[PDB]
Every structure is written in C-alpha cells, then in structure tokens.
From Swiss-Prot:
Effect of Y75W: Almost no effect on RNAase H activity and replication. 6-fold resistance to inhibition by BBNH
Effect the entry attributes to changing Y75R: Almost no effect on RNAase H activity. Unable to replicate. Completely resistant to inhibition by BBNH
Effect of E52Q: No loss of polymerase activity. complete loss of RNase H activity
Impact upon substituting Y75 to A/G/H/L/S/Q: Complete loss of RNAase H activity
Domain of life: Viruses
Binding site for Mg(2+) 2: D17, E52, D72, D123
Occurrences of domain RNase H type-1 (ranges): 8-131
This protein's encoding gene: gag-pol
Residue window of the full protein shown: 1026 to 1156 of 1447
The protein, known as: p15
Length: 131
C-alpha cells in the first residue's frame, strides 16, 4: 500500500480516537465522520495505543475505497507511515490488509485537545465513562 500526500476532496473523513483505563484496562475505540456517521465499540484488556489502532481499523472497515482518516495518535501514525509488510501484532496486520484493499487512503495527525472539531467530538464519545 501507499498513502496520499494530501486529503481526498469529497471523500468521507473519519475522525478516530481511543480511551483506555489503566487500572481496569477497559476501553472504547470509535470514530465520527463529516457525514454524521458515528461508531463506539467497547473494549476489554487493552491500552490507549491499542484503542487508537482499533479506532483506525474500524474507520477502514466502515469506510469506502477512498478515505481520509484523522488521528491524534503519534504511535499509530508512525506504524502506518512506516509501511510495514508484516507486524507481530495481529491488529496491525489486519490494518495493513485493509490498507492494501483501499484505492486511496489519506491519514493525517492532529494534536489531542486542541479544538480540532471532529477530533474533539470523537474524544468525548470514547472517553465517556472511561477516563
Ligand atoms: C491529555 C491526555 C490524558 C490524552 C492523551 C492522549 C490521547 O491520545 C488522547 O486521546 C487523550 O484524550 C488524552
Ligand atoms: Mn487519542
Ligand atoms: Mn482523546
């Protein structure tokens, strides 16, 4: 697979986010799209970074052949921008299989809690009752 250098104009944009509880290890991954599409999935035995990759996997599963994904996860961004062929993580390998499936993917990064509206909406959905 290959990543777009710039946004696909007109393609549904998924804002993704995760939240995990350290003590309990319970979490939520989800997304919110510019088209009013939303998804929250509860999670068990997980970490912050696993919920962030899980949010991305969901975005890819539910999207369309061209897609824009906007994450606040430096960790997942590195994984995906490094374009591995295979990883030890089953989750990463599934993400990679999705990315080979797409015609165009554009992934961008934005900082957490800085007012970027789609990011902020999904943060409140995933972090409800968790943080
Ligand atoms: C501000 C801290 C708690 C934080 C860090 C990293 C994230 O990815 C987040 O999504 C988040 O809501 C909060
Ligand atoms: Mn996050
Ligand atoms: Mn968040």
């Amino acid at each position: 697979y290959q990543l777009e250098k710039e946004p696909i104009v007109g393609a549904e944009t998924f804002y993704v986010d995760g939240a995990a509880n350290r003590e309990t290890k319970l979490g939520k991954a989800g997304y919110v799209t510019n088209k009013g599409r939303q998804k929250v999935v509860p999670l068990t035995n997980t970490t912050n970074q696993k919920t962030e990759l899980q949010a991305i996997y969901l975005a890819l599963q539910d999207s369309g052949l061209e897609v824009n994904i906007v994450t606040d996860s430096q960790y997942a961004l590195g994984i995906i921008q490094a374009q591995p062929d295979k990883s030890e993580s089953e989750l990463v390998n599934q993400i990679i299989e999705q990315l080979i499936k797409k015609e165009k993917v554009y992934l961008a990064w934005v900082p957490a809690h800085k007012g970027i509206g789609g990011n902020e909406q999904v943060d409140k959905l995933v972090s409800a009752g968790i943080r």
